[PDB]
Write a protein that holds these residues in place. Structure first.
Motif, PDB file in Angstrom:
ATOM      1  N   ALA A  42      78.215 -40.375  36.968  1.00 53.77           N
ATOM      2  CA  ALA A  42      77.113 -40.170  37.880  1.00 53.77           C
ATOM      3  C   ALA A  42      75.832 -40.002  37.050  1.00 53.77           C
ATOM      4  O   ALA A  42      75.880 -39.433  35.984  1.00 53.77           O
ATOM      5  CB  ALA A  42      77.377 -38.992  38.739  1.00 53.77           C
ATOM      6  N   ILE A  43      74.767 -40.691  37.447  1.00 60.31           N
ATOM      7  CA  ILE A  43      73.493 -40.647  36.756  1.00 60.31           C
ATOM      8  C   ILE A  43      72.394 -40.274  37.702  1.00 60.31           C
ATOM      9  O   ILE A  43      72.185 -40.993  38.645  1.00 60.31           O
ATOM     10  CB  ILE A  43      73.224 -41.991  36.116  1.00 60.31           C
ATOM     11  CG1 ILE A  43      74.332 -42.273  35.083  1.00 60.31           C
ATOM     12  CG2 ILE A  43      71.809 -42.060  35.608  1.00 60.31           C
ATOM     13  CD1 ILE A  43      74.364 -43.609  34.627  1.00 60.31           C
ATOM     14  N   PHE A  44      71.717 -39.155  37.525  1.00 62.01           N
ATOM     15  CA  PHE A  44      70.625 -38.765  38.399  1.00 62.01           C
ATOM     16  C   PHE A  44      69.264 -39.145  37.910  1.00 62.01           C
ATOM     17  O   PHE A  44      68.854 -38.603  36.901  1.00 62.01           O
ATOM     18  CB  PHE A  44      70.650 -37.292  38.541  1.00 62.01           C
ATOM     19  CG  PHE A  44      71.761 -36.794  39.339  1.00 62.01           C
ATOM     20  CD1 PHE A  44      73.048 -36.874  38.859  1.00 62.01           C
ATOM     21  CD2 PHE A  44      71.516 -36.052  40.447  1.00 62.01           C
ATOM     22  CE1 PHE A  44      74.069 -36.368  39.550  1.00 62.01           C
ATOM     23  CE2 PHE A  44      72.533 -35.507  41.129  1.00 62.01           C
ATOM     24  CZ  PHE A  44      73.825 -35.667  40.677  1.00 62.01           C
ATOM     25  N   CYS A  58      68.959 -36.829  34.680  1.00 58.80           N
ATOM     26  CA  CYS A  58      67.829 -37.514  34.044  1.00 58.80           C
ATOM     27  C   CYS A  58      66.463 -37.227  34.653  1.00 58.80           C
ATOM     28  O   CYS A  58      65.514 -37.856  34.235  1.00 58.80           O
ATOM     29  CB  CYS A  58      68.113 -39.010  33.948  1.00 58.80           C
ATOM     30  SG  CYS A  58      69.664 -39.376  33.091  1.00 58.80           S
ATOM     31  N   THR A  59      66.376 -36.401  35.698  1.00 58.94           N
ATOM     32  CA  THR A  59      65.082 -36.138  36.346  1.00 58.94           C
ATOM     33  C   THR A  59      64.272 -34.945  35.843  1.00 58.94           C
ATOM     34  O   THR A  59      63.045 -34.961  35.893  1.00 58.94           O
ATOM     35  CB  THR A  59      65.232 -35.911  37.870  1.00 58.94           C
ATOM     36  OG1 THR A  59      65.936 -34.683  38.151  1.00 58.94           O
ATOM     37  CG2 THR A  59      65.951 -37.067  38.521  1.00 58.94           C
ATOM     38  N   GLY A  60      64.978 -33.951  35.322  1.00 58.84           N
ATOM     39  CA  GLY A  60      64.435 -32.684  34.855  1.00 58.84           C
ATOM     40  C   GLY A  60      64.331 -31.665  35.970  1.00 58.84           C
ATOM     41  O   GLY A  60      64.181 -30.464  35.721  1.00 58.84           O
ATOM     42  N   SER A  61      64.603 -32.102  37.188  1.00 58.14           N
ATOM     43  CA  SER A  61      64.646 -31.178  38.284  1.00 58.14           C
ATOM     44  C   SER A  61      65.836 -30.278  38.120  1.00 58.14           C
ATOM     45  O   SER A  61      66.929 -30.717  37.854  1.00 58.14           O
ATOM     46  CB  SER A  61      64.669 -31.890  39.620  1.00 58.14           C
ATOM     47  OG  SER A  61      65.254 -31.026  40.567  1.00 58.14           O
ATOM     48  N   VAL A  62      65.572 -28.989  38.213  1.00 57.02           N
ATOM     49  CA  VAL A  62      66.585 -27.960  38.049  1.00 57.02           C
ATOM     50  C   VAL A  62      67.576 -28.080  39.190  1.00 57.02           C
ATOM     51  O   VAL A  62      68.784 -27.993  38.978  1.00 57.02           O
ATOM     52  CB  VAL A  62      65.989 -26.538  37.954  1.00 57.02           C
ATOM     53  CG1 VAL A  62      67.060 -25.558  37.757  1.00 57.02           C
ATOM     54  CG2 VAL A  62      64.999 -26.443  36.778  1.00 57.02           C
ATOM     55  N   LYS A 105      68.431 -38.412  50.318  1.00 57.03           N
ATOM     56  CA  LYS A 105      67.671 -38.364  51.552  1.00 57.03           C
ATOM     57  C   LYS A 105      68.497 -39.036  52.658  1.00 57.03           C
ATOM     58  O   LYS A 105      68.259 -38.768  53.830  1.00 57.03           O
ATOM     59  CB  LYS A 105      66.277 -39.031  51.423  1.00 57.03           C
ATOM     60  CG  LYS A 105      65.320 -38.242  50.533  1.00 57.03           C
ATOM     61  CD  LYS A 105      63.950 -38.890  50.218  1.00 57.03           C
ATOM     62  CE  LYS A 105      63.033 -37.799  49.597  1.00 57.03           C
ATOM     63  NZ  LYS A 105      61.676 -38.202  49.089  1.00 57.03           N
ATOM     64  N   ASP A 106      69.455 -39.902  52.298  1.00 55.17           N
ATOM     65  CA  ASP A 106      70.265 -40.553  53.344  1.00 55.17           C
ATOM     66  C   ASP A 106      71.482 -39.685  53.709  1.00 55.17           C
ATOM     67  O   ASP A 106      72.311 -40.089  54.507  1.00 55.17           O
ATOM     68  CB  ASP A 106      70.786 -41.923  52.886  1.00 55.17           C
ATOM     69  CG  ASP A 106      69.661 -42.892  52.479  1.00 55.17           C
ATOM     70  OD1 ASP A 106      69.937 -43.794  51.643  1.00 55.17           O
ATOM     71  OD2 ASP A 106      68.493 -42.725  52.902  1.00 55.17           O
ATOM     72  N   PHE A 145      65.711 -40.656  44.477  1.00 51.33           N
ATOM     73  CA  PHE A 145      65.089 -40.459  45.794  1.00 51.33           C
ATOM     74  C   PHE A 145      64.354 -41.687  46.371  1.00 51.33           C
ATOM     75  O   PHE A 145      64.211 -41.805  47.599  1.00 51.33           O
ATOM     76  CB  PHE A 145      64.056 -39.352  45.713  1.00 51.33           C
ATOM     77  CG  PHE A 145      64.649 -38.003  45.614  1.00 51.33           C
ATOM     78  CD1 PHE A 145      65.317 -37.455  46.680  1.00 51.33           C
ATOM     79  CD2 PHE A 145      64.414 -37.222  44.482  1.00 51.33           C
ATOM     80  CE1 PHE A 145      65.877 -36.198  46.593  1.00 51.33           C
ATOM     81  CE2 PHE A 145      64.942 -35.947  44.384  1.00 51.33           C
ATOM     82  CZ  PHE A 145      65.675 -35.428  45.454  1.00 51.33           C
ATOM     83  N   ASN A 146      63.994 -42.613  45.476  1.00 47.82           N
ATOM     84  CA  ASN A 146      63.290 -43.857  45.803  1.00 47.82           C
ATOM     85  C   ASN A 146      64.310 -44.960  45.837  1.00 47.82           C
ATOM     86  O   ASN A 146      64.722 -45.521  44.839  1.00 47.82           O
ATOM     87  CB  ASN A 146      62.156 -44.212  44.808  1.00 47.82           C
ATOM     88  CG  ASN A 146      61.437 -45.497  45.177  1.00 47.82           C
ATOM     89  OD1 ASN A 146      61.679 -46.003  46.249  1.00 47.82           O
ATOM     90  ND2 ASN A 146      60.643 -46.081  44.263  1.00 47.82           N
ATOM     91  N   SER A 147      64.667 -45.289  47.049  1.00 49.97           N
ATOM     92  CA  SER A 147      65.705 -46.227  47.320  1.00 49.97           C
ATOM     93  C   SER A 147      65.345 -47.596  46.740  1.00 49.97           C
ATOM     94  O   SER A 147      66.179 -48.495  46.688  1.00 49.97           O
ATOM     95  CB  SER A 147      65.973 -46.249  48.806  1.00 49.97           C
ATOM     96  OG  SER A 147      66.549 -45.019  49.183  1.00 49.97           O
ATOM     97  N   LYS A 148      64.082 -47.811  46.421  1.00 51.91           N
ATOM     98  CA  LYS A 148      63.652 -49.092  45.914  1.00 51.91           C
ATOM     99  C   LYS A 148      64.037 -49.364  44.466  1.00 51.91           C
ATOM    100  O   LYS A 148      63.895 -50.479  43.999  1.00 51.91           O
ATOM    101  CB  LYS A 148      62.125 -49.169  46.068  1.00 51.91           C
ATOM    102  CG  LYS A 148      61.635 -49.082  47.539  1.00 51.91           C
ATOM    103  CD  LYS A 148      60.101 -48.998  47.718  1.00 51.91           C
ATOM    104  CE  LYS A 148      59.416 -50.324  47.533  1.00 51.91           C
ATOM    105  NZ  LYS A 148      57.925 -50.153  47.403  1.00 51.91           N
ATOM    106  N   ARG A 149      64.526 -48.365  43.748  1.00 51.66           N
ATOM    107  CA  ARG A 149      65.070 -48.551  42.391  1.00 51.66           C
ATOM    108  C   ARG A 149      66.527 -48.987  42.355  1.00 51.66           C
ATOM    109  O   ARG A 149      67.070 -49.287  41.284  1.00 51.66           O
ATOM    110  CB  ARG A 149      64.770 -47.363  41.470  1.00 51.66           C
ATOM    111  CG  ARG A 149      63.304 -46.940  41.431  1.00 51.66           C
ATOM    112  CD  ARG A 149      63.122 -46.558  39.898  1.00 51.66           C
ATOM    113  NE  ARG A 149      62.588 -47.613  39.033  1.00 51.66           N
ATOM    114  CZ  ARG A 149      61.936 -47.406  37.895  1.00 51.66           C
ATOM    115  NH1 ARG A 149      61.986 -46.209  37.339  1.00 51.66           N
ATOM    116  NH2 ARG A 149      61.471 -48.402  37.161  1.00 51.66           N
ATOM    117  N   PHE A 150      67.153 -49.006  43.517  1.00 48.80           N
ATOM    118  CA  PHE A 150      68.574 -49.188  43.573  1.00 48.80           C
ATOM    119  C   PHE A 150      68.902 -50.653  43.156  1.00 48.80           C
ATOM    120  O   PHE A 150      69.774 -50.876  42.320  1.00 48.80           O
ATOM    121  CB  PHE A 150      69.131 -48.937  44.955  1.00 48.80           C
ATOM    122  CG  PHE A 150      69.095 -47.518  45.376  1.00 48.80           C
ATOM    123  CD1 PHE A 150      68.655 -46.545  44.517  1.00 48.80           C
ATOM    124  CD2 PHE A 150      69.736 -47.123  46.516  1.00 48.80           C
ATOM    125  CE1 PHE A 150      68.648 -45.261  44.888  1.00 48.80           C
ATOM    126  CE2 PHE A 150      69.766 -45.800  46.865  1.00 48.80           C
ATOM    127  CZ  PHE A 150      69.240 -44.876  46.033  1.00 48.80           C
TER     128      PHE A 150
END
Ligand SMILES: NC(=O)c1ccc[n+]([C@@H]2O[C@H](COP(=O)([O-])OP(=O)(O)OC[C@H]3O[C@@H](n4cnc5c(N)ncnc54)[C@H](O)[C@@H]3O)[C@@H](O)[C@H]2O)c1
Ligand SMILES: [Zn+2]
Ligand SMILES: [Zn+2]
Ligand SMILES: [Zn+2]
Ligand SMILES: [Zn+2]
Lengths: 375, 375
Positions: free
Chosen positions: B195-197, B267-271, B243-244, B223-228
């Motif tokens: 899994a890669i965040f 990979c986001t840095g979000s805790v 979000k889905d 969170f940006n589905s457009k990177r998928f």
């Protein structure tokens, strides 16, 4: 096999003295074996659930998971054990056919892994203990505080029959857990330093292990300063009482150690200690291991940069030893003078005086107290 | 060696368009090198410090830390480099003689580790850049948004001269950080799931590593589905947008994978993502890796049994790669057609349209935009 009538030390009520009762022990069913307990000892985990400190309290209950005993009979399907075998029951098992049993890395058998809420056997969901037709519930699938108990054969380690069961009973929980926490999981290199928070029987196995790994520095950390003197006998080189210092205890350690320890091993079960155990390792290569089972839900915290400073953090359970596979081998290690066990044993009481063992641990006076059945 | 006049895109003020100026580049002093820059790309880390998002605003400043160029001269004391060598400046160095550099485990030079506040050189605290005798400050000890820069040799990886500098410049930050996170820290086994965040340059490096590593299921989280859509080229087999989903993202992954992933990479840095990244892995053998750098000070939090059920948590920096020793090696992987880097480069602009790179990255339109000097 039929039903056995025997003595057990029963807990009817949270945090209260145990009662020796005449109980009835049902025969083993499929994949169960029935064991004569010869020797057992007390581990803090017993106390925690005995106090109903944290967990879902379940009573009445028969505790105990550190024990030495003899197979009295075996259930259907059992091929690796027979009546007369000398065995150690372990609180977590090894089926040999799950991914975890199949893994080189894990001992968390999908079948036989520790379960602290479960009061009955796997097979039928019923308890094998009763008094006056009422169930007395199991513990960790071992319930060794009874002259006879029933245990899944997968959680029962057959050992060398010449081994004195009254010494090697400690190999079934505390000792191996600390030991393995060090040798199998943290894995300190020669010359390295290790910090150990908690100096009970688990902490001291870990210390014995780091010494075994050739660690050059084993820092014992404990709130009970009176545990310190004996600790050097297990390989500890210095002791620190956090109360004796103004500095954060992790700051105390980092300074002792040109930046922090190489490995730390957490043995007490306090989250701040865990937090403290992680933060006291050196950046770049520090690895902290948690092994004490926590009662709080307090979060492990910290600025992530400690990690991004390439510090690893591993958690473990029962020293990552595979119970049926490794543990018989570890016992051999004592016959072989790698392991000195007599020193872990500080008190002895008869089964009839089992309550003395709760008193001693709670006074911080004992490492392990051996309880002797038939007295 | 004397002073050089060249073009540079100077930042006078936060979040404002860069301006191309004529600047003076002093000669390199002890342990420094002067590099002719051929290609550079932008990075989210550039934008952040350029925006004066958080730290201490420092202007005027020359940003840029991803670049490929050629040694023009070396200062006194440089032996591992000579004029003409093809090099990559790295935002963090390897002095080779500090405690971190000596360790097998760490790439965090005590001397040369990343510093976002420093505007001058180590040697003397001064800037090698000026306009009309006034300092223009360094950024990460590289300042590659200049035709020429001065860089401490500890921060310069001498690389293969056959390598196309316009491809391999992205290996010096974002890309290697993800890549190494997988291959060096997570170490997914062949056949395992990951899994890669975060699906930025870092995530996509991590995803790429898992593919290279032979992961059988590579789950992307953003969170940006457009990177998928673009991620499949990077080895991602599926993506999930929280979000889905109503359910906690860690719980979702766990049901999809029958208990959690074998490896995870945050990979986001979000805790909040750090907690999820750790908790979505499998007990027993699961390894979670944090690499995303937090912008906030919130603590990591988690229930301790998550560890004792034998999960492991590791943080790493720059993918645990050693700047001078390893980065040349990662470059060999691209040479040897192991690493496919080309797919990361979504734009190319001349040095003259450097402000477009900001736009492209700010619209989330780019993975990497390569900038070409001399135009
Ligand atoms: N992971 C396993 O498989 C396994 C096996 C056995 C025991 N355990 C658990 O390990 C822990 C230790 O077991 P034990 O029998 O050796 O206990 P013990 O009571 O004999 O020792 C606990 C030691 O930790 C010290 N301590 C308590 N709070 C402290 C704190 N804040 N900071 C520093 N030191 C502190 C105490 O002085 C004590 O000496 C328990 O938490 C137990 O439930 C786990
Ligand atoms: Zn125990
Ligand atoms: Zn199993
Ligand atoms: Zn970058
Ligand atoms: Zn260094």
């Amino acid at each position: 096999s039929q039903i056995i009538r025997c003595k057990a030390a029963v807990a009817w009520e949270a945090g209260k003295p145990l009662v020796i009762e005449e109980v009835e022990v049902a025969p083993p069913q499929k994949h169960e074996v029935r064991i004569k307990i010869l020797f057992t000892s007390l581990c803090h985990t017993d106390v925690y659930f005995w106090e109903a400190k944290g967990q879902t309290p379940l009573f009445p209950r028969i505790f105990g998971h550190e024990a030495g005993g003899i197979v009295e009979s075996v259930g259907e399907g059992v091929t690796d054990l027979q009546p007369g075998d000398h065995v150690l029951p372990i609180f977590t098992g090894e089926c040999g056919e799950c991914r975890h049993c199949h893994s080189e890395e894990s001992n968390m058998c999908d079948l036989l892994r520790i379960n602290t809420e479960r009061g009955g056997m796997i097979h039928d969901g019923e308890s094998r203990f009763s008094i006056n037709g009422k169930p007395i519930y199991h513990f960790l699938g071992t319930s060794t505080f009874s002259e006879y108990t029933v245990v899944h054969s997968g959680q029962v380690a057959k050992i060398n029959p010449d081994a004195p069961l009254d010494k090697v009973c400690i190999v079934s929980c505390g000792l191996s857990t600390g030991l393995g926490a060090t040798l199998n999981v943290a894995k300190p290199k020669k010359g390295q330093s290790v910090a150990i928070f908690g100096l009970g029987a688990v902490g001291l196995g870990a210390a014995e292990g780091a010494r075994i790994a050739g660690a050059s520095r084993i820092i014992g950390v404990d709130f009970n300063s009176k545990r310190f003197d004996q600790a050097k006998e297990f390989g500890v080189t210095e002791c620190v009482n956090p109360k004796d210092h103004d500095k954060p205890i992790q700051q105390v350690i980092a300074e002792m150690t040109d930046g922090g320890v190489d490995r730390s091993v957490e043995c007490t079960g306090s989250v701040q200690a865990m937090i403290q155990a992680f933060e006291c390792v050196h950046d770049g290569w520090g690895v902290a291991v948690l092994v004490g089972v926590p009662s709080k839900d307090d979060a492990f915290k910290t600025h992530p940069m400690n990690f991004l400073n390439e510090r690893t953090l591993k958690g473990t359970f029962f020293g990552n030893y595979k119970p049926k596979t490794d543990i018989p081998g570890v016992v051999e290690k004592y016959m072989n003078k790698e392991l000195e066990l007599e020193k872990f044993i500080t008190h002895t009481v008869p089964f009839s005086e089992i309550n003395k063992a709760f008193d001693y641990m709670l006074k911080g006076e004992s490492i392990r107290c051996i309880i002797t059945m038939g007295a």
